[PDB]
Amino acid sequence: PARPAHPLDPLSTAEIKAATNTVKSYFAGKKISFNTVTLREPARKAYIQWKEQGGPLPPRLAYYVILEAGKPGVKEGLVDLASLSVIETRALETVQPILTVEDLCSTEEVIRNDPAVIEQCVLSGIPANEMHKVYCDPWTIGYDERWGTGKRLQQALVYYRSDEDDSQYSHPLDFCPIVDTEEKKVIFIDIPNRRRKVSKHKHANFYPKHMIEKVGAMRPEAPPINVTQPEGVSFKMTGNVMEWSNFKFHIGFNYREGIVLSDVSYNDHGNVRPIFHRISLSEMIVPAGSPEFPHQRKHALDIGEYGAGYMTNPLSLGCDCKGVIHYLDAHFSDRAGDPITVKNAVCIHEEDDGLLFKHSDFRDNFATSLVTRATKLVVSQIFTAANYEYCLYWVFMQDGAIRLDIRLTGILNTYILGDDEEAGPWGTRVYPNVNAHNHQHLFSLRIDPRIDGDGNSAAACDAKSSPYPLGSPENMYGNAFYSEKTTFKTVKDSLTNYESATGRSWDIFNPNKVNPYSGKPPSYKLVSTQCPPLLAKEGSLVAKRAPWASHSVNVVPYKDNRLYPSGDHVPQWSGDGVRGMREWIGDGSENIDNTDILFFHTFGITHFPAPEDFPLMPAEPITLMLRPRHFFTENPGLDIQPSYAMTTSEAKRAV
Amino acid sequence: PARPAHPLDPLSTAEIKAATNTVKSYFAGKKISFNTVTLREPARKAYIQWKEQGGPLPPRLAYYVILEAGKPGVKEGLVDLASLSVIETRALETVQPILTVEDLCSTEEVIRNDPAVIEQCVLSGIPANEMHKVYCDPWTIGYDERWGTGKRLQQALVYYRSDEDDSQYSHPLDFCPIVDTEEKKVIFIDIPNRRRKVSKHKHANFYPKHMIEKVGAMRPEAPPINVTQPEGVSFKMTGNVMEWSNFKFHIGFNYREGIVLSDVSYNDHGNVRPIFHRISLSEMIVPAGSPEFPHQRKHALDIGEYGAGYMTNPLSLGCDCKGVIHYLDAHFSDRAGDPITVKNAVCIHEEDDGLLFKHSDFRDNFATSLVTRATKLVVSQIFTAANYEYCLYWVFMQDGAIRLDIRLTGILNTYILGDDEEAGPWGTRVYPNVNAHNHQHLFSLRIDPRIDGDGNSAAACDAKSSPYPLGSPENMYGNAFYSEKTTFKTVKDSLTNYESATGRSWDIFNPNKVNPYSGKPPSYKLVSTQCPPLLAKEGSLVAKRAPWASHSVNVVPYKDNRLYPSGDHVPQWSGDGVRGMREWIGDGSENIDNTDILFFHTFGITHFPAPEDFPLMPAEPITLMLRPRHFFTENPGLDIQPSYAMTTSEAKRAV
Ligand SMILES: [Cu+2]
Ligand SMILES: [Cu+2]
């Protein structure tokens, strides 16, 4: 297969095929299926050597995960593309892999044709001859102590559509089928003691035709707002490499994390300074809050159990991205080992972002004034996880900051509610017979920093009143306050939470350098405020399977391939065992001061559904920012042409 | 004078003149000057009666504040415009009023010509013949126990420009002159024990000509991004009344609070439902963190001591607002009693705001999909407070939410730093010989709610784990969590702070109504996270003068004219006494449950300066949101034409 331009480029359709052919041969005569075929990124050290020390081009490797009929668990390994050969392989019989769209799509037809499920539909008020009106979102079983990882299992959240164009979510059924993914048979059905038959109300729909019938008619089309860039865009791409407003970075993508930003640097007037080696979302967990059975099984780790890549929406059609867009496609392997493509998986573009900065002199009534508008570069993707959509926006700014914006939209995870049943404290009745359970949306931002070079550290920064009292010579008027910096020496020290009491922020800095003006080390500060405490209790399924979610910040030593905090194979893992973040933390004694570190940030929101969220919910925003603090010696955007600028002398001169 | 269209319209230039003429007559033969001439808004009850009960048009009143030469303090009163007569008047001899641009502009020339100040400049390294190069930002003295309110005083933060086009902030002087505003003489100069002469370095400038000399040259002009609305805008204004996407409200404006949004309602498919009666910023306080003398005097309450109206920038020229803009002008009175106008004080426009909502069905690979873009309505203003600029954005959204965005920009408040002096823990050395002190920016959002009608209440909402333990029948897997609602019965109960531990939010609801689906009362939830604790200690000047800043939330009974939390006349008030918020709180026993209430929210940021903030700082964002929760029975924006929408049947039908 042909080598890619960049060592970090995703595998090409050709590499994917080359890889699967190679694997198929190695397992000649075996009935195998492909779960994952993806780039095994080069070692950090080797990449940097290649990039800045004229070192050799790293070997082009493919990581694969396959299933073999009649064999428990999975088999994984590495394929060396240059020599078309398996160079590493092993079997993991007590593990279950990520669920692909193929894995998911087959489940619905099998429950529709299962006698037991059918009987349950009839009991629920649905004629056995109308099973084609029964639907289901096939989820991982998450984890169920009755089966462990002994069988690859899915749990089906069953719904009903009276018409194929309805939004099924207003009509959930009360039971839950457990399906053997690689046997295609229902092995058990969780049935509640309290039975609730199908809602007899009409579906809560949202397409225009439905709206016209529900309310009067649609609103008149609104006067258009057109955005044009007649002279082109200011950013430049060379393959997957981006260059914009002094930023230079590589836009990668994979089945699991979706967008992966690597080798990020800023051109400080000729001095090209590294910022991050790699940054992305490494895991998620959406824990529901009803303690009732079998709702404990609702705490999807979407990234690790489905993949933000595999689930990504093709962005072109929807008009998801406005303006002069540049797209990237994604390529994966299918069960058969053939490359599959999702067109326009990532969308890139720049847009106006308000004021960058402004200042006027009151002396001549603001005649003396300078105003510079801000423009941002946005690398985006949007993925669907059954009922919900996650809109991801990586944003680069002209003040050197990098921001991650997320918008939650889509549809509420709903369960059935009896006519006189109280949605209790665990959920909300958002429509007759519909219970939308409380749940949190937590994300794990993985940052591999290289702040102004190698050798980094992290610290918590808390605002505090001077400890001296009001009236003391040291704090006569009691207004004194400072920022207390606690730099993490050991892993244990980094396990910290956001604290509103100190308006806490965290710094990722380079202790080996010093800002010539402030005398502080150069840094990027994490300013993140939407940091929910993990509500599920210690020892809970949720807490055990997502060890990283317990703290807002987790800093561990760097090691090649420390990507996924809940383990490499998340589905059906009980949470017991030393793996993922639990393994990286170890006894918490390892050094993380002035070395190669990994910074995992947990953030997100706690969602208590309200009717406004139904039947389709308005976007809910989440954001975090990484700001350069003491990184530059002055505002880095002053050499950007102002939108307006009048000097005091010019103001005078102007009559 | 001619009556305005709307009872809430600001006084017209004609009304202002009519008012001052009337006042001048009442005080015939007296040497008086005008400090404030502004609308005295009609009583809440009368306005509502006029608006919805066919009641009489309220009397058109003007509130005034004047100074009389040789008389201590001020005189204030009300003028009935219809009968051109003073209907209420009184003298406040122990109070000092807001400082107008006129009040401020004269100070600089008086320090330049003061022998003592000159001597100090010479001592500081500035030839007495170069006083024209000496400048100063005239601040309120804030409060100084040496003079109280006995004399109207200003404190001058002295700076030096080697050229009139420089940004003086890189060159502060070490001393501080105290000036008698209404005597135009320096009465004292605070001189430090440690003397620091003028920085001999070059000014840290930021205009293009300066940048070309500092770095290579400016960056090339970037390819334009043009925004056009060929068919006009979707919003409609009738005078100061706005109608947009079902929202209807009145855009008011005054010298102090700047923009004032009133009589806000949402047209819920024919049912016009009130939301807020009035919402605005009622006060601010920017407390600095150096305990050293005379820096305690730096804690400007900008809104009450200068006025977000009086300080507002004319928005046209700067290209501050992009797109098809609609402007409003502001009118005030000058010292002489003559109307003054600031053109384009408020700018209004609508723009794209990303996705409103989206959802695709994985069953046909997202062929089945609906996407609706969001557009927002923005009412904005930008004001300059000496060195800093505050960019205010009131934003209305298509999901029924209202958001307040603020962007801090402008220049750091700087003081001189000795060559070998440590900016200590109280500030940052952002440039040679420049110390930018730590400080917080706190705002007081005043909300007079009328959530779906009259009779409102407020409550804190905290997310919590079920109190039942892991393994109990009630919480077998320990994932249970709910939202604990503590509704405030008494004023005392409302004094609460944001708490990250419970991801706290506050609800303003109508206990007299119930959402037919959720069974909860209709409400607007305050989702605000940038809520710094007040760092200045209890009993401190800061804490005493800004009683409202101690808590994130303060809810008091409504009373006509309870607008300004730090009192009507803020400058030089010691903070002792029962007035403002301290008065409204009283013994904290008054009822605030299901009645007419006022909700004051304290929010903002804590700023620890970094070199990136100098010599001009990049915009720093602050935001808070009011979301309808249980207000509607379903997503209110579903009748907006989707940007794209394919039904499942249409997807099939499409080959
Ligand atoms: Cu949610
Ligand atoms: Cu600041």
- What DSSP line would sit under B114-160, residue for residue? -HHHHHHHHHTT--GGGGGGEEEEEEE----TTTTTSS-EEEEEEEE
The tally of CA atoms less than 13 A away on the side-chain side of residue B224 is: 9
Instruction: Give the nearest chain B residue to A105 (CA atoms).
Output: B363
Catalytic residues of A: 302, 388
Q: Residue A26, class by beta-carbon neighbours within 10 Å (0-12 exposed, 13-18 middle, 19+ buried)?
A: middle
Instruction: Give the nearest chain B residue to A427 (CA atoms).
Output: B482
* DSSP-derived pairing of the beta strands A402-410 and B85-92: unpaired
Q: Where are the domains of chain A?
A: 1-100, 106-214, 215-653
- B259 has which bridge partners? B253
Option in B222, B539, B641 nearest A470 (CB): B539
- Amino acid letter at B628? P
* Cross-chain residue pair B362–A386, CB shorter than 8 Å: yes
Measured between beta carbons, the chain B residues lying within 8 angstroms of A640 are: 218-219, 222
Q: Cβ of B553 under 8 Å from any chain A Cβ? A: no
For A361-487, list the strands marked E by DSSP: 369-385, 388-396, 402-410, 414-416, 427-431, 434-437, 439-449, 457-465, 481-487
- Nearest of B556, B552, B576, B555 to residue B566 by alpha carbon: B576
- Nearest of B463, B477, B491 to residue B593 by alpha carbon: B491
Q: Count CB-CB contacts under 10 A for residue A559.
A: 11
Q: Cβ of A211 under 8 Å from any chain B Cβ? A: yes
- Nearest of A443, A342, A169 to residue B359 by alpha carbon: A169
Contact A504, A460 (CB under 8 A): yes
Would you state the structure tokens that stand for residue A238, as one six-digit string?
A: 């060379």
Residue B197 C-alpha from the chain's centroid: 37
Dihedral through CA B1, CA B2, CA B6, CA B12, nearest 10? -60
SS (H, E, C) A606-638: EECCCHHHCCCEEEEEEEEEEEEECCCCCCCCC
**Is B498 annotated as catalytic?**
no
- A136 has which bridge partners? A158
Q: Cβ of A180 under 8 Å from any chain B Cβ? A: no
- Nearest of A132, A65, A134, A158 to residue A103 by alpha carbon: A65
Mutate to test the interface with B, among A104, A357, A372, A640 (most CBs of B within 10 A): A357
Q: Which residues fall within 8 angstroms of residue B119, CB to CB, at 6 or more apart?
A: B128
Instruction: Give the nearest chain A residue to B465 (CA atoms).
Output: A535
Q: Which residues fall within 8 angstroms of residue B314, CB to CB, at 6 or more apart?
A: A366, B342, B343, B344, B345
> Is position A318 annotated in a ligand binding site?
no
d(CA B263, CA B207): 43
Q: Count CB-CB contacts under 10 A for residue A51.
A: 14
The tally of CA atoms less than 13 A away on the side-chain side of residue B296 is: 26
The single residue listed with the structure tokens 């405020």 is A529
Contact B65, B35 (CB under 8 A): yes
Q: What angle do CA A106, A409, A570 make, to 5 degrees?
A: 50
Q: For residue B476, which phi and psi values (nearest 5 degrees)?
A: -45, -45
Residue B75 C-alpha from the chain's centroid: 26
Q: Count CB-CB contacts under 10 A for residue B185.
A: 12
Q: For chain B, positions 595-614, list CB contacts with chain A under 8 A.
A: 605-606, 608, 610-614
Radius of gyration of chain B (CA): 27
Radius of gyration of chain A (CA): 27
d(CA B511, CA B521): 6
* Cross-chain residue pair A647–B165, CB shorter than 8 Å: yes
Contact B219, A372 (CB under 8 A): no
The tally of CA atoms less than 13 A away on the side-chain side of residue A308 is: 26
Please provide the distance, in angstroms rounded to a whole number, between the alpha carbons at the two ends of chain B.
Answer: 71
Contact B332, B62 (CB under 8 A): no
d(CA B152, CA B97): 9
SS (H, E, C) A311-367: CECCCCCCCCCCCCCEEEEEEEECCCCCEEEEEEEEEEEEEEEEEEEEEECHHHCCC
DSSP state of A530: -
- Nearest of A542, A501, A653, A577 to residue A300 by alpha carbon: A542
For A109-246, list the strands marked E by DSSP: 134-140, 153-160, 176-180, 185-190, 226-228, 236-238, 241-244
Distances in whole angstroms, Cα of residue A61 to Cα of each of A75, A90, A250 = 17, 16, 18
Note the ligand closest to the C-alpha atom of B607: 2
Q: Residue A5, class by beta-carbon neighbours within 10 Å (0-12 exposed, 13-18 middle, 19+ buried)?
A: exposed
Q: Give the containing element (helix H, strand E) for A85.
A: strand A85-92
d(CA A327, CA A329): 7
d(CA A229, CA A213): 40
d(CA A648, CA A643): 17
User: How far, in Å, from the CA of A301 to the mean position of ligand 1?
Assistant: 14
CATH class of A1-100: alpha beta
Contact A543, A536 (CB under 8 A): yes
Q: Which residues fall within 8 angstroms of residue B495, CB to CB, at 6 or more apart?
A: B550, B551, B553, B554, B585, B588
Dihedral through CA B536, CA B538, CA B540, CA B542, nearest 10? 60
Note the ligand closest to the C-alpha atom of A414: 1
Q: What angle do CA B482, B484, B490 make, to 5 degrees?
A: 170
Measured between beta carbons, the chain B residues lying within 8 angstroms of A399 are: 612, 618-619
SS3 B401: coil
Distances in whole angstroms, Cα of residue A373 to Cα of each of A152, A187, A352, A355, B293 = 54, 61, 8, 4, 38
Q: How far is A153 from chain B (nearest CA, A)?
A: 20
Q: Which residues fall within 8 angstroms of residue B420, CB to CB, at 6 or more apart?
A: none
- A349 has which bridge partners? A378
Q: Cβ of B55 under 8 Å from any chain A Cβ? A: no
* DSSP-derived pairing of the beta strands A258-268 and A247-254: antiparallel
Q: Residue A364, class by beta-carbon neighbours within 10 Å (0-12 exposed, 13-18 middle, 19+ buried)?
A: middle
* DSSP-derived pairing of the beta strands A369-385 and A644-646: antiparallel
Would you state the structure tokens that stand for residue B89, as one six-digit string?
A: 């008047």
Can the peptide bond before residue B294 be classed as cis, meaning omega within 30 degrees of 0? yes
Would you state the structure tokens that stand for residue A286, as one six-digit string?
A: 């959406």
H-state helical runs in B161-252: 208-214
d(CA A97, CA A153): 11
Option in B320, B360, B614 nearest A384 (CB): B360
Q: What angle do CA A107, A111, A114 make, to 5 degrees?
A: 140
Can the peptide bond before residue B615 be classed as cis, meaning omega within 30 degrees of 0? yes
Note the ligand closest to the C-alpha atom of A606: 1
d(CA B205, CA B185): 32
Q: Give the containing element (helix H, strand E) for B376.
A: strand B369-385
Asked if B106-214 and B215-653 have one fold, the answer is: no
Option in A287, A357, A616 nearest B359 (CB): A616
Annotated resolution, angstroms? 2.5
Method: X-ray
User: How far, in Å, from the CA of B363 to the mean position of ligand 1?
Assistant: 22
Q: Which residues fall within 8 angstroms of residue B168, CB to CB, at 6 or more apart?
A: B135, B159, B160, B161, B203
Would you state the structure tokens that stand for residue B30, as one six-digit string?
A: 């007296």
d(CA B340, CA B2): 18
Could you say which of B9, B114, B166, B302 is catalytic? Answer: B302
Q: Residue B642, class by beta-carbon neighbours within 10 Å (0-12 exposed, 13-18 middle, 19+ buried)?
A: buried
* DSSP-derived pairing of the beta strands A61-68 and B176-180: unpaired
Contact A575, A144 (CB under 8 A): no
Q: Cβ of B568 under 8 Å from any chain A Cβ? A: no
Q: What angle do CA B212, B217, B219 make, to 5 degrees?
A: 125
d(CA A159, CA B363): 14
CATH class of A106-214: alpha beta
Option in A165, A287, A318 nearest B479 (CB): A287
Helix A101-112 to helix A115-123 angle (10° resolution) is: 70
Q: For residue B63, which phi and psi values (nearest 5 degrees)?
A: -95, 135
Measured between beta carbons, the chain A residues lying within 8 angstroms of B608 are: 463, 483
- A486 has which bridge partners? A460
Dihedral through CA A373, CA A374, CA A375, CA A376, nearest 10? -170
Q: Cβ of B648 under 8 Å from any chain A Cβ? A: yes
d(CA B225, CA A127): 58
Contact A393, A132 (CB under 8 A): no
- Nearest of A376, A305, A377, A375 to residue A346 by alpha carbon: A377
Q: Count CB-CB contacts under 10 A for residue A564.
A: 22
DSSP state of B172: B
User: How far, in Å, from the CA of B105 to the mean position of ligand 2?
Assistant: 24
Contact A189, A120 (CB under 8 A): yes
d(CA B249, CA B320): 24
d(CA A58, CA A277): 16
H-state helical runs in B410-467: none
Output the CA torsion sign for B22, B23, B24, B30. Answer: positive
SS3 A553: strand
Q: How far is B207 from chain A (nearest CA, A)?
A: 7
d(CA A141, CA A137): 12
- Nearest of A546, A467, A457 to residue A493 by alpha carbon: A457
Residue B256 C-alpha from the chain's centroid: 9
- Nearest of A311, A314, A318, A315 to residue A254 by alpha carbon: A311
- A460 has which bridge partners? A486, A506
Would you state the structure tokens that stand for residue A564, as one six-digit string?
A: 């996924």
> Is position A588 annotated in a ligand binding site?
no
- Nearest of A491, A528, A530 to residue A507 by alpha carbon: A528
Q: How far is A78 from chain B (nearest CA, A)?
A: 30
Would you state the structure tokens that stand for residue B541, as one six-digit string?
A: 């000047």
Distances in whole angstroms, Cα of residue B478 to Cα of each of A218, A603, B468 = 45, 21, 8
SS3 A150: coil
* Cross-chain residue pair A223–B215, CB shorter than 8 Å: no
SS3 B424: coil
SS3 B621: strand
d(CA B25, CA A384): 72
Output the CA torsion sign for A95, A302, A541, A278. Answer: positive
DSSP state of A236: E
> Is position A622 annotated in a ligand binding site?
no
d(CA A527, CA B168): 31
- Nearest of B616, B639, B627 to residue B246 by alpha carbon: B639
H-state helical runs in B197-327: 208-214, 302-305
- Amino acid letter at B615? P
Q: How far is B433 from chain A (nearest CA, A)?
A: 10
Note the ligand closest to the C-alpha atom of A619: 1
- Nearest of B49, B51, B53, B42 to residue B82 by alpha carbon: B42
- Nearest of B296, B286, B292 to residue B417 by alpha carbon: B292
- Amino acid letter at B326? H
Q: Residue A276, class by beta-carbon neighbours within 10 Å (0-12 exposed, 13-18 middle, 19+ buried)?
A: buried
SS3 A83: coil
Contact B620, A625 (CB under 8 A): no
Q: How far is B184 from chain A (nearest CA, A)?
A: 18
d(CA A464, CA B425): 11
DSSP letters along A97-143, please?
Answer: PPPPHHHHHHHHHHHHT-HHHHHHHHHTT--GGGGGGEEEEEEE---
H and E: helices and strands count for chain A = 10, 32
d(CA A137, CA B344): 54
* Cross-chain residue pair A218–B640, CB shorter than 8 Å: yes
Q: Give the containing element (helix H, strand E) for A26.
A: helix A13-26
* Cross-chain residue pair A500–B503, CB shorter than 8 Å: no
Q: Give the containing element (helix H, strand E) for B601.
A: strand B597-607
SS3 A383: strand
d(CA B514, CA B532): 34
Q: How far is A271 from chain B (nearest CA, A)?
A: 13
Would you state the structure tokens that stand for residue A182, as one six-digit string?
A: 């690689």
d(CA B256, CA B98): 9
Domain covering B215-653 in this structure, CATH number? 2.70.98.20
